[PDB]
Amino acid sequence: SVDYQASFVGHPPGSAYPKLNFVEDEGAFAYVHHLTLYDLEARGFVRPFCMAYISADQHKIMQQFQELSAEFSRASECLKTGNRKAFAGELEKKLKDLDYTRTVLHTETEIQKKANDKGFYSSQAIEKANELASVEKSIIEHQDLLCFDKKLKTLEELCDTEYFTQTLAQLSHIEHMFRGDLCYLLTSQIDRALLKQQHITNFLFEDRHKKRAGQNALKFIRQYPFAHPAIYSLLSGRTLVVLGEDEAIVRKLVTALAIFVPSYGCYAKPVKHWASSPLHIQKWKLIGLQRAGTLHALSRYSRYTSILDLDNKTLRCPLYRGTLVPRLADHRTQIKRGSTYYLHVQSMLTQLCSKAFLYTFCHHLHLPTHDKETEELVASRQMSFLKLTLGLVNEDVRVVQYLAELLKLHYMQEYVPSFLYK
């Protein structure tokens, strides 16, 4: 029933010194990393007391076995270093305690009595100093390479865990790592398993309010008119600013649409998210300005801009007939969790990356090319889009833009109208 089984049948009968074994179930579906904590002041001078963690399905362990049994390796070993460290030190402490016996033993024996004792107890009083001094060297070597107190012995063994916090840190961190189900987890390995080989697609594009940072955008697109070219304007760029009356909203609704921005590369993000109004500058491709001084750079930079007015709707660059953004965003969409809408967005961008990936390469489209030199090749590059399934001449800009992002980094390591409607 309700959880009690941390040691119920989570303890194999010793069965080896460091061993790591398994249990079946009925509802247990368990796993055990049997670790004994041998205690001098304890019967057999040993203490099997093995902490691990137990989950369900028999599977989210079995094929996930390594790192769980590679971190239970690190965690359970870590505490073993600690209680021994308390135990190793205190053993000589009670050695000195019994060393004081000899200090009295010598005085008592044969002082005036002339050894009126046997005294064969003195054999005990000296033999103990040997094997305890022996297991000491066993402890330090074992450290580097390879009745109420009896249960209360477990206390300091469990108490010194609290001190030597690393054992509390890992099992806390372990409880963080694995979760209720492996699958959403399992992809995360696979997702990052793939990412190792391909990194060019990583910098060219985006890759913890992310529940809200997604959900707000879904509440954005699904019920905000004219928002469609906004994404386009944002995706293509090459700049955008958004001003509003109360700044209590722009913070909320510029983290929503921050997903779409192509970060320059190995940086944090290009969304300044707002500033004052000097507006000198290819360094910041999203700004708030929360605001006739602005109305000048409004028109002085009639190129590379856009606006908003929550008071009465507007923008600057609504020209788009293609189908790509409709796939990136359709107002007749049923995506619910929003966080999932992030995934649908996140996935699609890889395709946009993928098409963009192709255009950079193919080693038949750059200046070395078959037909001729002047502009035929620029016509020739157009026929690449026949292989590259463009949407419309507007989409030609996007994929051409991502070259510039990709072209720049390989290089480093080496005109538009404007509408508006209510």
Partner: protein
């Protein structure tokens, strides 16, 4: 107290155990590996078998069905995977248990196979659990007084391949980590109606079903230059559970793994074996390199299970009808990336990356709509258009990467309608 079976190969696994349950015996009879230079002493093995015994004794209220065990003993380095049986009375723990014994440092090799191994053995007990009433023969009570002779035969032969199967993957050294594209794709372009038209037909078929099937050809090299190619489309944990087939190594169709091989098709008509193909985890293809054709079995979980239901208790079907634009895309330009360099692999992953991510949405998507009684999804008509899934070639593919993550997903959607 032993039976020596030589293994064809270099480095097989270790022995197996068949201890009995009146008084719990350490071990009844032990199978043997190839005539190796040095083994692990039976006396050590006898204890190791007896070690699970009292561990097995620890179980209460024996079971309803056969259940698993698995040991790794750092002391006396070994990896053990035992079973608990269902008793004859089903309450009196007449368990006997069995486990192939595995040398240390080979759990990396083992663990991806662990599904294979349990499957192979759990069938043996399914055969074993009768319970051997042929040993309940017409015989005098002196005979009815029996275990150590009449039990081993049907146990012997049916457990012989398991060591060979496990030692097979060392021989058919299926690529563990990576490959430079000694596969097809390293070529410039095949450029022809048949082969290029074929190449798409297979890979699509290789995907709408999770697990590929034999490259049943007659070249043993051009036969092996497809199995390493169609396996770029599967996980690094699936770089194994595959086989690079070898020239006449007398190796049958084994249900467990889901990329395979053979050669020459037994020089004549050879059974699938029709019985063993169901016992695979998925439907699968029927790729050739002789005919350059393809086939496939019914949809992975709405009809194999029903076919499974027909045949599980008894004890080349269709061609690719679908042409995903997404894969027709992929394959069309992959050769256009000027091969020879590292480009295609990256593109491959980016293609692949999409599928898992695009799979993951569909995972989240359907699991988002709260499952309830009278409440299936029923929104597939919305689902198709919504997620950019309109090419029926593309839908089932991502629907086919579902089951590899949510095994019950595919029934959760098609069980009610079909």
């Amino acid at each position: 107290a032993k039976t020596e079976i030589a293994l064809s190969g270099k480095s097989p696994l270790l022995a197996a155990t068949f201890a009995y349950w009146i008084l719990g015996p350490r071990v009844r009879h032990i199978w043997a590996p190839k005539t190796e230079q040095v083994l692990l002493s039976d006396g050590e093995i006898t204890f190791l078998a007896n070690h699970t015994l009292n561990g097995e004794i620890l179980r209460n209220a024996e079971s309803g069905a056969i259940d698993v065990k698995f040991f790794v003993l750092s002391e006396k380095g070994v990896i053990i995977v035992s079973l608990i049986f269902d008793g004859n009375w089903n309450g009196d723990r007449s368990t006997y248990g069995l486990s192939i014994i595995l040398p240390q440092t080979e759990l990396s090799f083992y663990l991806p196979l662990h599904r294979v191994c349990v499957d192979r053995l759990t069938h043996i007990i399914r055969k074993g659990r009768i319970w051997m009433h042929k040993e309940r023969q017409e015989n005098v009570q002196k005979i009815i007084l029996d275990q150590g002779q009449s039990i081993i035969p049907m146990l012997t032969g049916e457990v012989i391949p398991v060591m060979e199967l496990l030692s097979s993957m060392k021989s058919h050294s299926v690529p563990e980590e990576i490959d430079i594209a000694d596969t097809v794709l390293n070529d410039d372009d095949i450029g022809d109606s048949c082969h290029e038209g074929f190449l798409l037909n297979a890979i699509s078929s290789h995907l709408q079903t999770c697990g590929c099937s034999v490259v049943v050809g007659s070249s043993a090299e051009k036969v092996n230059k497809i199995v390493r190619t169609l396996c770029l489309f599967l996980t690094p944990a699936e770089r194994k559970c595959s086989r690079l087939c070898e020239a006449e190594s007398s190796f049958k169709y084994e249900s467990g793994l889901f990329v395979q091989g053979l050669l020459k098709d037994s020089t004549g008509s050879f059974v699938l074996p029709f019985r063993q193909v169901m016992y695979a985890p998925y439907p699968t293809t029927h790729i050739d390199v002789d005919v350059n054709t393809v086939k496939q079995m019914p949809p992975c979980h709405e009809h194999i299970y029903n076919q499974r239901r027909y045949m599980r208790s008894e004890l080349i079907f269709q061609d690719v009808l679908h042409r995903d634009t997404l894969v027709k895309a992929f394959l069309d330009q992959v050769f256009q990336l000027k091969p020879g360099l590292s480009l295609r692999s990256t593109f491959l992953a980016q293609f692949l990356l999409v599928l898992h991510r695009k799979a993951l949405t569909l995972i989240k998507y359907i699991e988002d709509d709260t499952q309830k009684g009278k409440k299936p999804f029923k929104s597939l008509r919305n689902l198709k258009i919504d997620l950019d899934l309109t090419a029926e070639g593309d839908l089932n593919i991502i629907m086919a990467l579902a089951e590899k993550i949510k095994p019950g997903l595919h029934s959760f959607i098609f069980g009610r309608p079909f």
